[PDB]
Ligand binder design. Structure first.
Ligand SMILES: *CCC(=O)[C@H](Cc1ccccc1)NC(=O)[C@H](CC(C)C)NC(=O)COc1cccc(OC)c1
Ligand SMILES: *CCC(=O)[C@H](Cc1ccccc1)NC(=O)[C@H](CC(C)C)NC(=O)COc1cccc(OC)c1
Ligand SMILES: [Cl-]
Ligand SMILES: [Cl-]
Ligand code: NA
Ligand code: NA
Lengths: 305, 305
């Protein structure tokens, strides 16, 4: 029993993190096979970031201008390519620690584990969620660029994120491993705005099941609601709308508790309309929305790797 | 910027986790050099756990009763030992992935990273804190026994915890790597109570510094308090007393913020007496106490490993 902000084991990813240096900028890269992936602004100066032309800047670069180092091994760049906003550097050695991997593009609401590194070496791991506005609320200091977020499927590492920027508001933005940004953001140091963040309602419902599984059950009530009735109260509170697909996905948790999904929705409706009245659920006085339903199944069903 | 519940990268520890089977019981073990460390109740049946005689049971056990498996490879037990509550099994092979390590016994209030494994396979990682009552509030399903907690110091893994049991209240208890239980607990299935839990005040003050570093500054006040004045208000709210040794430890954070330690104590005193009044600190409506001052410095400095 117990519920914790838990992240996938990061060992597999740790063997893929290299230090990439171009000019005076040093950031992190992801070494998979004989290719290193790093955020393409490695090539920019502090003055270039304000309005960068990356095709002109990369033309001025050469293979010997990129210094890639995996621990004690200095890899040699034998090629450089720019796919969208990521720079792929071809290297003369292949990472023997390359895991079975796949590049995926996650959706808003999905969560992932972030291996935050600085100058190529892992510093920590924590669980994040792709916010509905395609930002994330992580912890990234200068040099954490090229830190990647991922999920593991038994033995297959699904790389889903690479960090690029902290927006002026403090929220973070990044790309998939093919270089396409999550959200309306650009790798240019100009004021950029993120959309109004909304609450992932299906993840709140997932968290409330984890709460019932653990012994907090004061919030349960004998009523049942409709998806539409709930969604009018939810939309008012900047809460995401619940579809039939969310109800289907919550099926497994409903099954192990015997609490129908529209039965828990009625409990979530009273919480939003009446607050928690100074009570806590799983120890929190607020409603957590960064646990997918799959996260709850994992933490209360094992799921090893 | 950003502040997250972050855990040390678990790759190093992953290379030490093995599956240990004695009889019908199968749990996790820690493979360091030619010794596997596992919880000594591996030798117990559910009928033995209710009142176990570990000296009587171990007599009936021999080296061939223990089945240790590192993935696909069967390690061969050539010796078995019982130190306090841990079973040290000698094996015919030494772990080639052994990190430079040390067994440490942490204090209440110190934090560590937990690698939760099941059946020998790492499943997840999260950051915990030794509660003042010598419990920890993690996430452990049956089979999680022998999971280890740790901190990393550059390249040296400091193993500080091994999980043994979940108490009836839902909180968790375990040992150091020498088998000595943290707290007043015994490895027997009988109702056992933990002492009254208190709030680690030094970790709240550390966390409030993490908040100011990040932009949360509504709680700051022009007033300053005395250590005695503060400790009289805190004890009433079941907050641990803050000593001059704690103030010394918070020094680095005071230097980086320009906010004296007793200046922050004055902000904490109003928070205890007046609550948060619909404000959040780093996104929370409650006061977090599971971040040590070294954790805050680590997350706001970039310490790698
Ligand atoms: C790994 C961090 C960086 O290298 C990154 C470069 C960068 C790219 C694009 C826009 C701005 C900077 N810097 C970065 O994100 C910093 C990190 C802070 C911890 C200092 N953030 C800022 O500089 C914030 O200011 C800012 C101003 C205007 C635009 C913008 O992003 C759109 C950020
Ligand atoms: C890895 C988990 C175990 O193997 C462990 C064995 C054990 C040791 C000591 C006392 C009791 C059990 N079991 C364990 O802790 C379970 C785990 C739950 C996820 C089922 N917890 C309980 O059985 C809780 O009940 C309990 C009753 C009486 C005493 C006691 O601990 C003192 C726990
Ligand atoms: Cl593409
Ligand atoms: Cl022997
Ligand atoms: Na209900
Ligand atoms: Na003050």
């Amino acid at each position: 029993s117990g519920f914790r902000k838990m992240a996938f084991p990061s060992g597999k990813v740790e063997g893929c993190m290299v230090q990439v240096t171009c000019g005076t900028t040093t950031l992190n890269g992801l070494w998979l096979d004989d290719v290193v992936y790093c955020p393409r602004h490695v090539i920019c100066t502090s003055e270039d970031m304000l309005n960068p032309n990356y095709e002109d800047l990369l033309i001025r670069k050469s293979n010997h201008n990129f210094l890639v180092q995996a621990g004690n091994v200095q890899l040699r760049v034998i090629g450089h390519s720019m796919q969208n906003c990521v720079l792929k550097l071809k290297v003369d050695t292949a990472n023997p620690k390359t895991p079975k991997y796949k590049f995926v593009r996650i959706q808003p609401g999905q969560t992932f584990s972030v291996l935050a590194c600085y100058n190529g070496s892992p510093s920590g791991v924590y669980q994040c969620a792709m916010r509905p506005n395609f930002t994330i609320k992580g912890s990234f200091l200068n040099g954490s660029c090229g830190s990647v977020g991922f999920n593991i499927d038994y033995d297959c590492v699904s790389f889903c994120y690479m960090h690029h920027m902290e927006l002026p508001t403090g929220v973070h933005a990044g790309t998939d491993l093919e270089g396409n940004f999550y959200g309306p953001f650009v790798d240019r140091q100009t004021a950029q705005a993120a959309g109004t963040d909304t609450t992932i309602t299906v993840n709140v419902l997932a968290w409330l099941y984890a709460a019932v599984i653990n012994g907090d059950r004061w919030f349960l009530n004998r009523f049942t609601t409709t998806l539409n009735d709930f969604n009018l109260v939810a939309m008012k509170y900047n809460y995401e709308p619940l579809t039939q697909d969310h109800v289907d996905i919550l099926g497994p948790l409903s099954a192990q508790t015997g609490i129908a999904v529209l039965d828990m929705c009625a409990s979530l409706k009273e919480l939003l309309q009446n607050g928690m009245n100074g009570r806590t659920i799983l120890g929190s006085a607020l409603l957590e929305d960064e646990f997918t339903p799959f996260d709850v199944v994992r933490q209360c069903s094992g799921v090893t790797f």
